[PDB]
Design a protein around this ligand. Structure first.
Ligand SMILES: Nc1ncnc2c1ncn2[C@@H]1O[C@H](COP(=O)(O)OP(=O)(O)OC[C@H]2O[C@H](O)[C@H](O)[C@@H]2O)[C@@H](O)[C@H]1O
Ligand SMILES: Nc1ncnc2c1ncn2[C@@H]1O[C@H](COP(=O)(O)OP(=O)(O)OC[C@H]2O[C@H](O)[C@H](O)[C@@H]2O)[C@@H](O)[C@H]1O
Ligand SMILES: [Gd+3]
Ligand SMILES: [Gd+3]
Lengths: 187, 187
């Protein structure tokens, strides 16, 4: 395949719409910052989840703490750690890579890195705590549909059941977005 | 929350970009057809997966057979069944709902229904067959990143391990997209 020509159709707050001419057909791409989410598992196998309104669906969805990689030059896990604190007031001693997911492969370059945070300390001074198994059943029951949450919950469930292991922070993030950030549309 | 006003910024082949004024801030939404995917498990616990090029990432990703709900008035599972046949030349006697996922909750209304198809017959006249456990490990190892694939693979893995059950075809698909189709931008 080959990109013949590409044209910017729109630049917004968190993404830009671009149209390319490929190998020869049209291919519209939503350039995204990319994001990070966190599965913060405590000493008893519970993780915190937030109930957030999503205008796209016109309703609140249960999700993992998460934020966009909108801070230029900021390392992903630093962004992640920041969100875990701001989102659920937790700090973690151990940070590992749990699962990366390409959210909308058909039309956007967004990719999300989900970290597994352990060794939690409540710091600072809607969300709910769920036993990992309870969370896994909510997924398989349709009560958790956010794609990042689904991946993170079922991944940590596979880990907690001894089926798989978390990974090193230096694990390559193959599809981490760069296009939108490269635009630097900020005065 | 409340949508003050909404403006169409772009209408493309598979999606439209719309900007709303919410409750008061800007909220850009990518209206999508929605899609369906299939986890076709054979009698030995294997499922077929396709290796497809995704321009968004500039590379091929391992995925579950899937297609957009771009056929007006066509029932999702009929679309699904059609794709399973066209994509991997398989027909299934049993169709159930496995997992629904909201792909990019932050900027698009797309939602994808993943069905579990069983009782397979090879019909007609790149893809590969994977034991469900092999597929689950590929996910946790980063070799499967497509979000729909991640959800489907780990969901059927939870099913095959006896942790959860498939669901009836009449299960409500809460976030099934309707906006883009409603536009009917076809002469
Ligand atoms: N469609 C949009 N249009 C304009 N602004 C938006 C839009 N969507 C979100 N924003 C905004 O960006 C800011 C949200 O930042 P974060 O809290 O860092 O991230 P978040 O929206 O929760 O997304 C993290 C991740 O989860 C979602 O599943 C989303 O798809 C993304 O990958 C919001 O306060 C608001 O300015
Ligand atoms: N960004 C795009 N711009 C223009 N046309 C596109 C674009 N992306 C895909 N298409 C096209 O739509 C048709 C593909 O249809 P399907 O095979 O029905 O579906 P598919 O693209 O594989 O997507 C199914 C699902 O998987 C992906 O993860 C995608 O995010 C979606 O939910 C392609 O042949 C081509 O016309
Ligand atoms: Gd935030
Ligand atoms: Gd097709």
């Amino acid at each position: 395949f080959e990109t013949i020509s590409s044209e910017t159709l729109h630049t917004g707050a968190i993404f830009a719409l671009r149209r390319d001419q490929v190998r020869i057909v049209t291919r519209e791409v939503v350039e995204h910052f990319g994001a990070v989410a966190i599965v913060a598992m405590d000493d008893n196998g519970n993780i915190p989840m937030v109930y957030q309104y999503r205008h796209t669906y016109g309703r609140r969805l249960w999700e993992l703490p998460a934020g966009l990689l909108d801070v230029a030059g900021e390392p992903p896990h630093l962004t992640a750690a920041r969100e875990l604190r701001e989102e659920v007031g937790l700090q973690a001693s151990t940070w590992q890579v749990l699962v990366d997911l390409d959210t909308a492969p058909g039309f956007s370059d967004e990719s999300v890195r989900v970290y597994l945070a352990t060794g939690l300390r409540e710091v600072g001074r809607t969300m709910g705590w769920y036993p990992i198994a309870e969370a896994a059943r909510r997924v398989l029951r349709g009560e958790i549909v956010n794609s990042i949450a689904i991946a993170g919950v079922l991944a940590v469930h596979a880990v907690t059941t001894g089926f798989a292991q978390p990974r090193p922070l230096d694990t390559e993030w193959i599809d981490r977005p760069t296009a939108f950030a490269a635009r630097r549309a900020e005065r």
